[PDB]
Design a protein around this ligand. Structure first.
Ligand SMILES: [Ca+2]
Ligand SMILES: [Ca+2]
Ligand SMILES: [Ca+2]
Ligand SMILES: [Ca+2]
Length: 391
């Protein structure tokens, strides 16, 4: 009955494969560097997302030859926590970062063991000034960082999660077949300039400039930050963003993802191919190209084999649940059922979905599905009811 989940999760899975959530890197030959772009989703404490669109560029500080990558991405897992004995405004951060996106150097040497890190930031957002110091270490063998940041000026005037991207991609793990694409370590020890502009949707933007390089045996990130046009009661200056990661692999949740996974893996081999992804998408009335199938897959394909295997699927859904979708995204999902776009999923509409999905349900079982979802009782599922169902 609560079999909204399987179908909900499959639609949600296609949504993930359809989005662009990683950190995309491209060569910037004119600068002998790289450029990057990506999106960050910040949960709003009471529901919703604050999106932050990043544009990035990096040039080497030295003249030594450096590595210019083919296009690829980094994939980041962050967990933010608090130190229970710390009385200052602070953030504990634990991060894992792995390169992927390409299918199957001398500075790299400096990163084979544990390397100490110092971070220093001065900022100014809407005239509100502040500093942050951070210290910890980096273990590139595993793409790992552990760091503790302190707001050295008192209360931080923006939420800590908005600073995470600004506060050392040289610590990411490149897999063996991609080592030639690691611009970040190749620029070391003398390092690189990293610049960004970061747009918070419906709000202000940050401009950052940082110098990242070895000082002694320590990897140091020194940063200036300027934010303008922030709304005094927006999510940023109003402090309306969640701090807590919310990282809850709830095991009955894993079992829910397995169920969705099986809708796609119809031969039961524990991997999803383009054939299989295509089949599910046509059933739902899309018509992706062979190339789009390869790109969708490549977006979550950690090993580069061209397929989404089961662990890669759990990792992707994990992230899809930790982050909040935008209205546009929840609407697009809704439309997968709302075939005529009137605002209402009718009994007939849900039938057409479930039937085309190969799901063997009766006009009686379909009726039960509506009832489970139909709060207001009109015999249909409207937008809000859909949202409640999907939570
Ligand atoms: Ca399969
Ligand atoms: Ca794979
Ligand atoms: Ca409809
Ligand atoms: Ca209703």
């Amino acid at each position: 009955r609560r079999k909204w989940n399987k179908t909900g999760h499959a639609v949600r899975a296609i949504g993930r494969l359809s989005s662009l959530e990683n950190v995309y890197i491209k060569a910037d030959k004119q600068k002998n560097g790289i450029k990057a772009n990506f999106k960050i989703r910040h949960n709003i404490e009471d529901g919703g997302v604050q999106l932050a669109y990043h544009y990035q560029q990096n040039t080497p500080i030295g003249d030594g030859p450096v590595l210019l990558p083919d296009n690829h991405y980094l994939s980041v897992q962050s967990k933010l926590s608090k130190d229970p004995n710390e009385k200052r405004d602070h953030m504990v951060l634990l991060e894992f970062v792995t390169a992927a996106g390409i299918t199957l150097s001398k500075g790299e040497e400096l990163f084979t063991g544990v390397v100490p890190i110092l971070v220093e930031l001065d900022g100014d957002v809407n005239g509100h000034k502040f500093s942050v110091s951070g210290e910890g270490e980096g273990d590139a063998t595993y793409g790992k960082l552990t760091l503790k940041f302190i707001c050295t000026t008192g209360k931080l005037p923006v939420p800590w999660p908005t600073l995470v991207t600004t506060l050392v991609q040289c610590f990411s793990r490149y897999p063996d077949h991609m080592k030639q694409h690691d611009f970040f370590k190749s620029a070391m020890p003398e390092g690189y300039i990293q610049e960004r502009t970061i747009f918070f949707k419906d709000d202000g933007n940050y401009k950052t400039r940082a110098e990242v390089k070895f000082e002694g045996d320590t990897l140091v990130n020194r940063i200036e930050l300027k934010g303008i046009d922030f709304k005094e009661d927006g999510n940023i200056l109003g402090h309306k963003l969640e701090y807590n990661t919310r990282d809850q692999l709830t095991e009955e949740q894993i079992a829910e993802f397995k169920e969705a996974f099986s809708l796609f893996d119809k031969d039961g081999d524990g991997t999803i191919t383009t054939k299989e992804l295509g089949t599910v998408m046509r059933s739902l009335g899309q018509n992706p190209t062979e190339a789009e199938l390869q790109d969708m897959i490549n977006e979550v394909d950690a090993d580069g084999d061209g397929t989404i295997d089961f662990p890669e699927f759990l990792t992707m859904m994990a992230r899809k649940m930790k982050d909040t979708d935008s209205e546009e995204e929840i609407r697009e999902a809704f439309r997968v059922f709302d075939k005529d776009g009137n605002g209402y999923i009718s009994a007939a509409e849900l039938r057409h979905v479930m039937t085309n999905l190969g799901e063997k349900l009766t006009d009686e079982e379909v009726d039960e599905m509506i009832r489970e979802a139909d709060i207001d009782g009109d015999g249909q599922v409207n937008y809000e009811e859909f949202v409640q169902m999907m939570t």
